[PDB]
Design brief:
This protein is α+β, with helices and mostly antiparallel strands. The protein has a single domain, classed as Nucleoside Triphosphate Pyrophosphohydrolase (Alpha-Beta Complex). The protein contains 4 helices and 7 strands, in the order E-E-E-E-H-H-E-E-E-H-H. A 4-stranded mixed β-sheet has the order 4-1-6-5. The chain has a 3-stranded antiparallel β-sheet with strand order 3-2-7. Strand 2 and strand 3 (35-36) form a beta hairpin. It is globular. Its cofactor is Mg(2+).
Length: 147
């Protein structure tokens, strides 16, 4: 069958390096102008923290549980308008996405094995926040990386 619709309940994981404070930015394959932290749908049968862990593993091949890293629950949830040009992946009538925020500090920067994006960059947090098209991604970088 066709790829099932994305769910309008999602997670965001802001990955950064504790040592340099640079933020891991990833180039989307649907909109190559859209660089971002890790995002994805919370699927039926999983919780948001579980979705965050799965997506981090699937997208950037970092196993939070295996590395004994701390997946920080930001305890922030926002709602935003799905970008017009990306709405095609959601069910008919769906225009609003609800996103819950997490952060993940790696001890150092590392080379990244990415699977779903086109490219990655490690950027100073202001540069990262400035680059992303996502307002929520920007705000999460500002509040939980930059401070």
């Amino acid at each position: 069958k066709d790829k099932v619709y994305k769910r309008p309940v999602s997670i965001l994981v802001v990955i950064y390096a504790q040592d340099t404070k640079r933020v891991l930015m990833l180039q989307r394959r649907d909109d190559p102008d859209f660089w971002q932290s890790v995002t994805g749908s919370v699927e039926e049968g999983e919780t948001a923290p579980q979705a965050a862990m799965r997506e981090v593993k699937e997208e950037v091949t970092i196993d939070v549980v295996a590395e004994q890293l701390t997946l920080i629950d930001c305890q922030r949830t926002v709602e935003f308008e799905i970008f017009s040009h990306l709405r095609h992946r959601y069910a008919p009538g769906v225009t609003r996405n609800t996103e819950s925020w997490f952060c993940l500090a790696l001890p150092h920067e590392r080379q990244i094995v990415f699977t779903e994006h086109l490219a990655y960059k490690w950027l100073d947090a202001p540069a990262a926040a400035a680059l992303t098209k996502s307002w929520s991604n920007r705000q999460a970088i500002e509040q939980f990386v930059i401070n």
